[PDB]
Design a protein around this ligand. Structure first.
Ligand SMILES: Nc1ncnc2c1ncn2[C@@H]1O[C@H](COP(=O)(O)OP(=O)(O)O)[C@@H](O)[C@H]1O
Ligand SMILES: Nc1ncnc2c1ncn2[C@@H]1O[C@H](COP(=O)(O)OP(=O)(O)O)[C@@H](O)[C@H]1O
Ligand SMILES: [Zn+2]
Lengths: 317, 658, 45
């Protein structure tokens, strides 16, 4: 049975639990990696046919007016297709989302909700919980002089989602490592003679306040971020949740929040969101699929790209 | 299982040694065209025996592949992988027989008197390729295997006991007790009849006889296992060396280790020729490297020329990629380290000053100098990929100068004074200063590298992102055609062949081109002499792709052009360093006007009604000044024909007006 | 170092009786000197 397990795997191992205090261990016998019992629950939702909006309204049922943001979160939870190009090439099939916004726009509650919903979500604040909490390091074992890995925020979130609140405060040693994780899904460490690469298959969801604290309508948008273009290019669905006072919009959000703290329900009565237990199964089931597009829309994309590509030349100046 | 029938094996080896021909080597590898009847027909191992008996060396090199190249020894090849000791005794007897039979029984000479007493040993080395250290299993114990790796720590020459010297403490009688299977038998009584005192013997330490034992540590992957070395195999390995090992896997209480038995420290030929002489060779090779990346011909060539390399003589080429942070930079570097042997992937903040530099320290018990490897030491002879090369720390960036130019890392710290070797090639990618490339600032202000570092790179590629749909749409098609539903083996086989056999030499004619190209480049006054050696290395790398024994004008001119295209010289203003975003002027209009008028004058002035384009070129273009491209002449005559001023009846002739 | 080569090779020419030279791999090996009356030969030049 040797060379079956590998580091970082999630497995169910069957064995015998064997031993004036006795020390205990397990003798491995059978190992497996990670259904009609849940197919019935999956059948109910697809029977209704409400797929995008229902699940997008299901995530964070106590947050007002963020349907467009939630939809991006819904896709990020599901993710794309990790296309193995071949010939040694590789293209990531994950979605990275950045949530810029003014203070008091509930852009951190989404970070909590994403970590709660995802089975592999990791919640992180500040400077990536310092440089030691971010990335990873090799630690010597004083008992056997061996060196083993101690997983940080990104390494733990492997095959998962990493939320980084207050991302603008991240140091250069923090953000430079983010580039390789965002782009390569791997972390390369060369310290104390050790030259190893770590699996960092993570979805990065960052929410941060403007560079100058807040947004005033006279301010240009690029001046409200501390991030260069390379980071903004590696993000997708780059949001900008500006807060503009309004007697007809603050009224709705206030009424939405005040009902959340008043009763144990969302303010909407005509719509009931899917419970997280059923959401997890449907998302997992949906994630198993591998759709492939047609050549007709393939030619459609190159036309729409050029349409969007040419506009930005005028817009930037 | 003592499967060794000693009479059978000594008979097979007698057959093997006295009948093997060098010709049989070409059959297993199917090199039938490589049969040379002038030398391969003679017996192979008999020549070694004639040498080692005359040299006085007690060793013979056993190339284990020749066992498979002979039919009877095939039954012997499998059992050799389990029982090597019996062969050694057979070989010793065979050498003794060889001296007796081939020299004195043949009455050739008598230079064998001492050979009767000396002990020989034959060491098999070329066992078939093995599965590596990490694949070994407990069932492999005591079976000869093969490994490769890197040396880290070497212990000094430990003297191992073989003969014990005892002296009686009351009568001073001296014995000579040998070691039998690693045990020392201490006499309990003096051996003399007169002196019979019990426990009267004593061991004298410095009159004993010892044998050299060396313990060497080898690292194949970052795992590593301990090795044991004995006898005349000392003084063969030092820290930091790369070794191929053929030895025996052991275990003693668990302590798995290798009884090293040998140490090494150093049909498709027609298929290569069929690609060698083709016309689209350069484009096909350049395209093949990155099938997922569109166009970028110049980027393809240089990075390919990086893999070919220069020619070290009694050579590495480094490249920097500067461009907007959305264009193919990362993908090529990922390909390079996954297509080159033992490449290392590095980043700015992911490494340290002791990341690329091996951590040299001194042993706490043997007090020798040991090294714990490093990025620039692991990739010796290979390619190191560095992302975010701009964001490298200044201390980390500082140590590159000696590495890039002298391929050494000297360290002077408390108690340690030594220098290493880190000969390697560097591939680096750097984002532009700020967010995106700005043509308003000069080229040197968009690069965060000081001139001393910036001068070392052989090629700096300015990769710029345009908005022209004439190339965007083609790129879009190339990307979109890849996510619905030469090969790398040919490429690596091609590359591995060229680096092994091709050693080009610069010719006299090609010498002048290098001089003039640098002088002209210098005359525009950052043309340090580090760029001139960059031209020569690229010149050798081009011919290595060409698989030609020499480097010639086309190689030099293409190398000059590649540097020109990489740096984007002609599109850069010579007095401000700014980039011309536009790359028919009135001066060009005047040039074509005068060229057409001169073509008319030549056509009407010559005493022939018609002439060929080659005749016109010889008369005008090549007659004076450096030859200009004939396309302009063709364009002018085509314009005149469209205006009905000249007659073009065919490609080979041009005729006067009607 | 290069001067030592002409020194070591010079010995065999004046001592063709106790040292012999033969080549392997393109390199040179030195046969075991039977040094006897070493001083007498240098005076014959
Ligand atoms: N639309 C909303 N729905 C529900 N709660 C909200 C909403 N807007 C703000 N809040 C409340 O305000 C707080 C927002 O703070 P936070 O999510 O940390 O935003 P920021 O990242 O700007 O600090 C949350 O505790 C949340 O309860
Ligand atoms: N000329 C090109 N050929 C193929 N793919 C390209 C080209 N230019 C851009 N791309 C695409 O743009 C993306 C850029 O990613 P990459 O080059 O790895 O890092 P960066 O975004 O920092 O340049 C790649 O996924 C690649 O597929
Ligand atoms: Zn005695």
């Amino acid at each position: 049975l040797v060379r079956s397990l590998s580091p970082g795997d999630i497995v169910d191992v069957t064995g015998i639990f064997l031993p004036l205090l006795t020390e205990t261990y397990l003798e491995a016998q059978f190992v497996r990696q990670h259904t009609s019992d849940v197919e019935e629950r999956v059948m109910e939702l697809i029977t209704s046919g409400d797929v995008y909006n229902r699940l997008a309204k299901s995530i964070a049922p106590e947050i007002y007016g963020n349907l467009d943001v939630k939809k991006a979160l819904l896709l990020l939870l599901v993710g794309g297709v990790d296309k193995r190009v071949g010939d040694g090439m590789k293209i990531r099939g994950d979605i990275n989302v950045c949530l810029m916004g003014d203070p008091g726009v509930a852009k951190s509650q989404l970070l909590k909700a994403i970590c709660k919903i995802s089975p592999r979500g990791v919640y992180t604040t500040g400077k990536g919980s310092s440089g030691v909490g971010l990335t990873a390091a090799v630690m010597k074992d004083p008992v056997t002089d061996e060196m083993i890995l101690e997983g940080g925020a990104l390494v733990l979130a492997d095959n998962g989602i990493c939320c980084i609140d207050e991302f603008d405060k991240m140091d250069e040693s923090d953000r430079t490592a983010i580039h390789e994780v965002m782009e390569q899904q791997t972390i390369s460490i060369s310290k104390a003679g050790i030259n190893t690469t770590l699996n960092a298959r993570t979805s990065i969801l960052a929410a941060a306040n403007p560079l100058y604290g807040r947004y005033n309508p006279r301010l240009s948008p690029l001046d409200n971020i501390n991030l260069p273009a390379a980071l903004l290019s590696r993000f997708d669905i780059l949001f900008l949740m500006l807060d503009i006072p309004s007697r007809d919009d603050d009224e709705k959000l206030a009424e939405h929040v005040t009902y959340v703290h008043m009763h144990n329900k969302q303010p909407d009565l005509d719509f009931t969101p899917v419970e997280p237990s059923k959401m997890r199964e449907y998302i997992a089931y949906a994630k198993t699929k591998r759709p492939v597009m047609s050549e007709a829309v393939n030619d459609y994309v190159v036309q729409a790209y050029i349409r969007l590509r040419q506009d930005s030349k005028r817009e930037m100046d | 299982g003592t499967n060794v029938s000693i009479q059978e094996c000594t008979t097979n080896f007698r057959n093997f040694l006295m009948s093997f021909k060098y010709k049989f080597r070409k059959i297993l590898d199917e090199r039938e065209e490589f049969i040379n009847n002038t030398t391969d027909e003679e017996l192979y191992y008999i020549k070694q025996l004639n040498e080692m008996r005359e040299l006085g060396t007690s060793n013979l090199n056993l190339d284990a592949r020749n066992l498979l190249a002979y039919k009877q020894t095939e039954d012997l090849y499998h059992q050799l992988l389990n029982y090597p000791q019996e062969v050694i005794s057979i070989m010793d007897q065979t050498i003794k027989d060889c001296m007796v039979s081939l020299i004195v029984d043949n009455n050739l000479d008598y230079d064998l008197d001492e050979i009767e007493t000396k002990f020989y040993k034959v060491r098999p080395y070329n066992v078939g390729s093995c599965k590596g250290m990490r694949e070994l299993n407990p069932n492999d114990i005591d079976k000869l295997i093969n490994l490769k790796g890197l040396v880290l720590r070497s212990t000094p020459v430990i003297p191992d006991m073989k003969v014990a010297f005892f002296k009686c403490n009351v009568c001073d009688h001296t014995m000579a007790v040998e070691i039998d299977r690693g045990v020392i038998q201490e006499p309990a009584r003096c051996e003399r009849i007169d002196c019979n005192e019990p426990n009267s013997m004593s061991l004298i330490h410095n009159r004993c006889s010892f044998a050299d034992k060396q313990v060497i540590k080898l690292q194949e992957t970052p795992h590593s296992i301990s090795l044991c070395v004995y006898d005349e195999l000392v003084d063969s390995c030092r820290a930091g060396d790369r070794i191929e090992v053929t030895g025996t896997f052991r275990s003693i209480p668990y302590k798995t280790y290798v009884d090293v038995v040998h140490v090494k420290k150093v049909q498709d030929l027609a298929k290569i020729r069929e690609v060698a002489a083709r016309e689209d060779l350069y484009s096909l090779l350049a395209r093949s490297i990155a099938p997922s990346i569109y166009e970028l011909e110049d980027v393809k060539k240089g990075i390919l020329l990086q893999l070919f390399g220069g020619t070290n003589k009694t050579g590495d080429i480094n490249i920097l990629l500067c461009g907007d942070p959305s264009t193919s930079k990362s993908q090529i570097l990922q390909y390079v380290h996954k297509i080159t042997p033992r490449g290392v992937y590095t980043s700015g903040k992911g490494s340290s000053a002791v990341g690329l530099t091996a951590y040299i320290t001194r042993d706490v018990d043997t007090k020798q100098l040991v090294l714990e490897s490093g990025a620039l030491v692991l990739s010796d002879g290979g390619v190191c990929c560095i992302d975010e090369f701009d964001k490298m720390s200044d201390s980390t960036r500082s140590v590159l100068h000696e590495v890039m130019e002298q391929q050494t890392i000297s360290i002077a710290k408390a108690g340690i004074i030594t220098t290493l070797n880190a000969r390697s090639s560097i591939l680096a990618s750097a984002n532009p200063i700020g967010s995106r490339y700005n043509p308003n600032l000069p080229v040197t202000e968009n690069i965060d590298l000081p001139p001393p570092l910036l001068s070392r790179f052989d090629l700096v590629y300015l990769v710029l992102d345009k908005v022209d749909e004439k190339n965007d749409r083609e790129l879009a098609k190339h990307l979109t055609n890849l996510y619905l539903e030469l090969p790398v083996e040919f490429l690596t086989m091609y590359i591995s062949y060229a680096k092994e056999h091709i050693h080009p030499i610069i010719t006299e004619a090609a010498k002048t081109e290098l001089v003039r190209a640098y002088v002209g480049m210098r005359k525009m006054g950052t043309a340090t002499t580090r760029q001139l050696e960059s031209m020569i290395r690229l010149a050798e790398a081009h011919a290595k792709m060409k698989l030609k024994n020499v480097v010639e004008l086309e190689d030099v001119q293409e190398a000059v052009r590649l540097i020109r295209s990489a740096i984007k010289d002609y599109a850069t203003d010579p007095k401000t360093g700014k980039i011309d975003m536009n790359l028919k002027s009135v001066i060009q209009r005047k040039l074509q006007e005068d060229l057409s008028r001169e073509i008319m004058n030549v056509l009407k002035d010559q005493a022939s009604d018609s002439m060929s384009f080659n005749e016109l070129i010889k008369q005008i273009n090549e007659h004076s000044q450096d030859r200009v491209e004939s396309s302009d002449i063709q364009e002018a005559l085509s314009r005149l024909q469209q205006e009905d001023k000249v007659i073009v009846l065919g490609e080979g002739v041009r005729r006067s007006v009607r | 170092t290069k001067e030592a080569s002409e020194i070591l090779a010079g010995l065999q020419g004046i001592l063709p009786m106790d040292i012999s030279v033969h080549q392997v791999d393109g390199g040179l090996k030195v046969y075991r000197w039977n040094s006897l009356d070493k001083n007498r030969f240098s005076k014959l030049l």
